[PDB]
Amino acid sequence: PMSTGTFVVSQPLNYRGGARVEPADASGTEKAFEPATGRVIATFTCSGEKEVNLAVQNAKAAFKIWSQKSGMERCRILLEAARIIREREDEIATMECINNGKSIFEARLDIDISWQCLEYYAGLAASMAGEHIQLPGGSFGYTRREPLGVCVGIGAWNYPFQIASWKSAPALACGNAMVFKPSPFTPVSALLLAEIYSEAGVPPGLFNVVQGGAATGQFLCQHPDVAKVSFTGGKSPLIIFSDCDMNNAVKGALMANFLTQGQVCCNGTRVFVQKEILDKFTEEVVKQTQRIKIGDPLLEDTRMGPLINRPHLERVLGFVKVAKEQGAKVLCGGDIYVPEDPKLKDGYYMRPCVLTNCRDDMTCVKEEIFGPVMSILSFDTEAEVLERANDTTFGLAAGVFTRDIQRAHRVVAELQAGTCFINNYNVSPVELPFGGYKKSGFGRENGRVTIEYYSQLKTVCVEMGDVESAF
Amino acid sequence: PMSTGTFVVSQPLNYRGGARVEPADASGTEKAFEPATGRVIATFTCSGEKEVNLAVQNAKAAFKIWSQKSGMERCRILLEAARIIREREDEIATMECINNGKSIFEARLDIDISWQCLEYYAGLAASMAGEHIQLPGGSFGYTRREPLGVCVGIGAWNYPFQIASWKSAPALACGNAMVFKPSPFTPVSALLLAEIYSEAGVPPGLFNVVQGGAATGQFLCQHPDVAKVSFTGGKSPLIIFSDCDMNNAVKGALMANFLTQGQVCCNGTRVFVQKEILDKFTEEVVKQTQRIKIGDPLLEDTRMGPLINRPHLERVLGFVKVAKEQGAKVLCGGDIYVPEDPKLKDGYYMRPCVLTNCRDDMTCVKEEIFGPVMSILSFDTEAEVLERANDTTFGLAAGVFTRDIQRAHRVVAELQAGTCFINNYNVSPVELPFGGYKKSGFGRENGRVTIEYYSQLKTVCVEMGDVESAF
Amino acid sequence: PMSTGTFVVSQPLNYRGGARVEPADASGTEKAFEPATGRVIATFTCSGEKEVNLAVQNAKAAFKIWSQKSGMERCRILLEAARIIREREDEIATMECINNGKSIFEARLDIDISWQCLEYYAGLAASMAGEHIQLPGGSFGYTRREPLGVCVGIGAWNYPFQIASWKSAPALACGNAMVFKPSPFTPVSALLLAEIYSEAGVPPGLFNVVQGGAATGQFLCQHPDVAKVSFTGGKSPLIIFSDCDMNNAVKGALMANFLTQGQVCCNGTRVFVQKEILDKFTEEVVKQTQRIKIGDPLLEDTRMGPLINRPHLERVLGFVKVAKEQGAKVLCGGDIYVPEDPKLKDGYYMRPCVLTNCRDDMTCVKEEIFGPVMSILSFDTEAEVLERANDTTFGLAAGVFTRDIQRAHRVVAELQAGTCFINNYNVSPVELPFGGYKKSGFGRENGRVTIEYYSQLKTVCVEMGDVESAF
Amino acid sequence: PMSTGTFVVSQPLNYRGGARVEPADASGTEKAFEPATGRVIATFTCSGEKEVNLAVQNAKAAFKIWSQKSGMERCRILLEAARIIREREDEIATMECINNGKSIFEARLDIDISWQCLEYYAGLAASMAGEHIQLPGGSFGYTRREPLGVCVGIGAWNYPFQIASWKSAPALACGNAMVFKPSPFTPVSALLLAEIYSEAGVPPGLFNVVQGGAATGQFLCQHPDVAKVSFTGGKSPLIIFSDCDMNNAVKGALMANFLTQGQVCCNGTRVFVQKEILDKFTEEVVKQTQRIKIGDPLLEDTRMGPLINRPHLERVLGFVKVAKEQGAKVLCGGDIYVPEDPKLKDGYYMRPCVLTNCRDDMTCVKEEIFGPVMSILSFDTEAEVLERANDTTFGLAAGVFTRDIQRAHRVVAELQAGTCFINNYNVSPVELPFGGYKKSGFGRENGRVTIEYYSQLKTVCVEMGDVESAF
């Protein structure tokens, strides 16, 4: 029932004690946009010290109720929330599209990851166990993972609903309360999650929302009743060898660069192509790039939406200008795009860019752009690429395309990237295990480790006999 | 063959590439003492930036060799190290006593923990595995725990050999190298571990030692080739109820206060005693305290050695003076002790102190002393104690003495302490699981969690089929 | 909308390919009853060899489809099944009462365990992973837990819907098909589960139901295409010491003996009471037993329903007759009960029995009755009870009532029972972890172990280098 | 110090109470041989019912002591046993060859796995923990893995010392005793393990040895005080595709067939070779097979020793005769071998056999020979091999040789074998994880699962509040 060019926020954008509330305090005002049209969908207040304290106080009170509930009870409520997310999926997805600009196609995938996340941690809540140890003379020791208390979740604008779910679901599962601060660019979708938690049966104040930027963030970090804060080198390389499957290598390169309008750090933007296939590959990539459907993100066939902001679009367009000044050849795009739909005339659109004759010294190769810009770097040998792509940090991903699996594993072994892809590339947030493949699951280690972030181990030792005095 | 009043360091105190070396660069000079006699056992150079660089560079080189060895090979070496520590135990324990001042009796327990710790992480090294996940169409995702590289360990003076062992054993078991900076108070024992690692078969420079203070520490933290750095409300309460086992409560109180000369934060120095037993308990506690054998730490019957240095002893005596000014009754000790052996005359000795008529407003009750000082606070009800001991942080321990186990579990539940003891109290470092009970073992969570600190998870996704393009 | 004295089966009681079917081959005929009224609710054919073959062949085909689906897809379906069980709970619970005779109070608790069980194994399906190991020279090894194929589940009459869910949920979560053979006494409720699995989206034939007894069972076990079969000394002691909480000890004794009409092996029927409290306890237990509401199991206030069938009721009454012949004093019950409601006149009712002056030589003390019969044995010392109750097997449970927790732990340590209760008793099936406490959860070991029963570990080794020939 | 043609057993071959004993009771007599010479090294008594009882009663007494020792103490003893095995390795390995006939080369590998096994389970013993669960109102539930009691380990003749170690280490690590029955062919080496356990500090009776056959085995299974018994369709295929690395494929085929004189079921004896490379491969395999050094197993350069005994050697030669009658071409070997050393003149030697023009209808292809016999079957397509090798059971292994990894993984997926090898083949016992690769480790799952086999989970529930009565 919701469409592009019509949405306007009509309710308060903070959320405390199970209801939408206006900030009690100001730390500034921000404007949220519909990137597809360039319309202001909200002029909202950033939360001040007093508003931040009301949220934390109200979450501390909920924490006391929720932490005392069983893992079984907590699981029940989180599984309900996942069911509500699943039922209201298209409504949630369209709202994320309206405010962020990603295609409905990509918003649905992010929403899926969100309710899957909830189910996973709900399951972990119901199956949590500590250790029990036997001590001589009937004595014993035991451990328990306990919540920390009020957790602060800091959002980002690229995956607003998903970052909200990903932070709250494990924190809540362990028995914590959370005060969530969305990115000021994207305030809207986090409130849908807040409402859903309430509807599911979460105690009022367990999941609170405070809008604001840096000042709000500082107030949250400095708060004495806040237990923990959950925040959110060379760029991600993609190595294409001459022996690879060309069609799959091209598909992978496009997915690596133009999903989420290339606005993510997990994007494999440094495309190293072997000299022999270099000409054939570039020809095919440009042909395919020029065919990407740009327009209204609510349209099912749209694959490229607008960029997050006008400042952001301008910054990306500046990278393109610097690249051709540094000697790169713009094969296609990197120009402002004006869509055929008149309602989209002032949207933050640009044609996806493919740059060739790229060098390691270039700032477009050295720096993360956060726009749809592919840098094609030519290479000759396996030793050369490994030497050129060594500067990759653990926090980044990497992709390798070669029919030789000895070569593939050898390249992956030497690469310092945390996530490596052989004959594929997935653009998925860092938190998601196994490179965010659809039918992957989460394994057990991801959950165990993220649970440890939102908890602490309490140890109890019960002496059944007499004390062994050294004195 | 080694005794008190005779030891003098005759070799360099830094350790690089399998040998004792002298600092290349200097950041100051320090004096290490024999606390039992007050003798200078070493005048050593604090490592400067160039010395810190040589250590990290030599360890970066060792890591490259060691990380490539199998977990089985790494286990083999760490098990040999444990065997050597076990064989050379008395020699290591006397060295620990000479520089630190703890009784031989307590030093042996710390050396036992140290070789047990190596055996544990050796075992984990041999049994480490990542996850394997199945993906549609014969594709698969998998994970590997990888070492980080060069890790920094920062020693403390209260458990020198044990802290060196505790930080280096997991770090090395993951495939990392380590540059260790002992407390400048206690430089000696870390070199015995250094030598043992070499003897066990560790590649040269895998476990390096840099002496120094804050300046050396800063150069280590600021070093770009350093992957990780492992560093070392109210104080620990002990609640004695009128229904408890008096003899066990007294034994527990003495252990909680006078082990390691009361110089640890783990010590349960805030002793809350119920009004009825208060008189009977204090009488027994003073009787038992006055019987603690003070003297040469290398003597088998010694239970109390000297304090770490003269500044620390003076600071502790200052606390006692302020306490009697604040209105506390010194029941015994808190005075400088002159041992009967003349060689021990300038040792940092004091009689263990018992203070009564203590208040929550007193600085001796509010502040951690790091000396043998017991503060006895009278209480009337269970609600009162819980309200008075609520200010305890998670990093601290707590002890409860009551014959009513419902009362015991109720008290432990309300207490915020990370380690709670029912009808006992163990003074053991926070790292040690299950309150450091002698025949406890480590369980599996401790090892798993500490391994995660010294490692990182690498994910590889192997696509067996074709790429599913969104475009 | 469903009530006692009106239900009659109107559909076939076998289930294959997503529909109810009449057995293709016979192995006899059975009659299922409404124990509350003594009415025949069904006359059904026991499955023959050809019918058993059709169900295993059908399951083998569904297995091939299901085992190829992802853990995530399997989880989705199982969570839908749990949702449907939860929605249709009262309808399932009344059906369980109608055929089995347990109170709706207990029936609801049984249906709760069933859908909780489903959710737990759905969660495990989505998080399943094998191991990944690194081998020298880039080679690697990995494991995968694979389904077995067609699994066979044998039902029991005391927990019909619960046993069906408990066996099918883990088997299905792994990727197996299941042919389920309910107890001929209770054929009805398993078909509600089979219909729910279908409704949830399970492939036709993944959960097939074959009616029959021993012959049907043998054919299933003998079948070559059946991977695995899941089947359904002294008796469970309850030790009441003179120092215990009398009211809690009485409540625990009633729960331990008269839940599920005392028709389970988990029942703590051997009640050892210390000489001093023996008189006081017996007086209170009889007073409380005589207050148990016997009647229509569909009534909310009913705590005791009828016994499974007339043969069973007669067998239990026989035990009571032998007991008074052996010298026991029937304090209350053990007599045929004729309920006030005329529609229940022909139901399998008896008054719950309390026997005193019991001896270890008595057959009522030596043998499991499977009826509401409590045997009170007097005892004098802790050493005496431990000697008299030592004959308890690991498969049984045990209960201890004492205010002294050292005594409690000492008794539990010496007892050979697999499940021990201190100051409580739960009557729960063996499969359920942590003595089947409400708000316990399942922990992680239970699920892990039961998943291992329904799966097998496949190992794959990928050689990346050259083969190291011994020759 | 020990050499071929000189060894004679001079001590009793049963072991009870920390000493070698003569069986109390008999069930026949057997002769043990030196397969290299054909000499009788022992004429020993098979254990009767009374001897089996004495061993069990003795073990039961040591269990009571050992089960009460801490996990830490058992670990210490098992690590000592591993150290003694490691020190006395060459002595144990020569004894293993003397009686079994495997090459000292392979015997040393067996002995390595043995002491590695002990270390792994020693580590698990020290780190064992149960679960702890929190229940409402301060109540709690906890689990503990307890030993079973007296376990029985049945030996095999192909890995005598290794099987003894593989069964005794997890049982003893769990707190059980074990009564071990070696294969009557190989009685000697198990006594070396028995002696070592004693020397390490194991209580007398912990690891007892009863010599005997099937009769002795039955007595052990039938014994009422025995808790558990640990016992020892087409054959293992090896698929060589035309696209593979020929030299590696040949090496792998020789390893798969001629290691342990081809006397194991894990040997990949069904060698399917693609029509194109068939001629080239056969030529190379025969060339390499003819170069295998047959002789004194104690000689360092020996790769093939004699077969276990005269009957086995004769049975294998019979298979070769039937094969050429069925139409197979003996390319090399399958003939009695007379070694140049005159002391080995009556040893059970034969030349390793290579058969070509093999059919699926042949008994040499259908049946497991347990001798050095390779059956080369020609094939044309991938679909054909998968159809011909489908009959492989889960208990068997499989090997695939192809440069195409998609093909390799596709073949491995379709194969029903429990262990699959890509571009390699390891002949290792089933118990060993990750196809028994040298620097593999055991991972965590293997140990977890073999501990569960030798233990039972005891659950304790502590009620802190009031009993919730249904009545």
Numbering used by the authors:
A (entry chain B), B (entry chain A), C (entry chain C), D (entry chain D): 0 to 231, 256 to 494
Describing publication, verbatim:
Aldehyde dehydrogenases (ALDHs) catalyze the NAD(P)+-dependent irreversible oxidation of aliphatic and aromatic aldehydes. Human ALDH9A1 is a cytosolic tetrameric enzyme of ∼216 kDa that was first purified from the liver and characterized as a 4-aminobutyraldehyde (ABAL) dehydrogenase (ABALDH, E.C. 1.2.1.19). The enzyme is involved in the carnitine synthesis pathway comprising three other enzymes: trimethyl lysine dioxygenase, 3-hydroxy-N-trimethyllysine aldolase and γ-butyrobetaine (TMABA) dioxygenase.
Co-crystallization with 50 mM NAD+ with or without 10 mM TMABA product resulted into different crystal forms. However, the three solved structures from P21212, P21, and C2 space groups at 2.5, 2.9, and 2.3 Å, respectively, reveal an ALDH9A1 apoform in the absence of a bound NAD+ or TMABA. All monomers are very similar to each other with an RMSD up to 0.24 Å. The αβE region is not visible in the electron density maps thus is highly mobile. This region interacts with the bound NAD+ when present in ALDH structures, and the absence of a bound NAD+ in the HsALDH9A1 structure is in agreement with this largely disordered region. In our three HsALDH9A1 structures, the inter-domain linker adopts a unique fold, never observed so far, preventing the binding of any substrate.
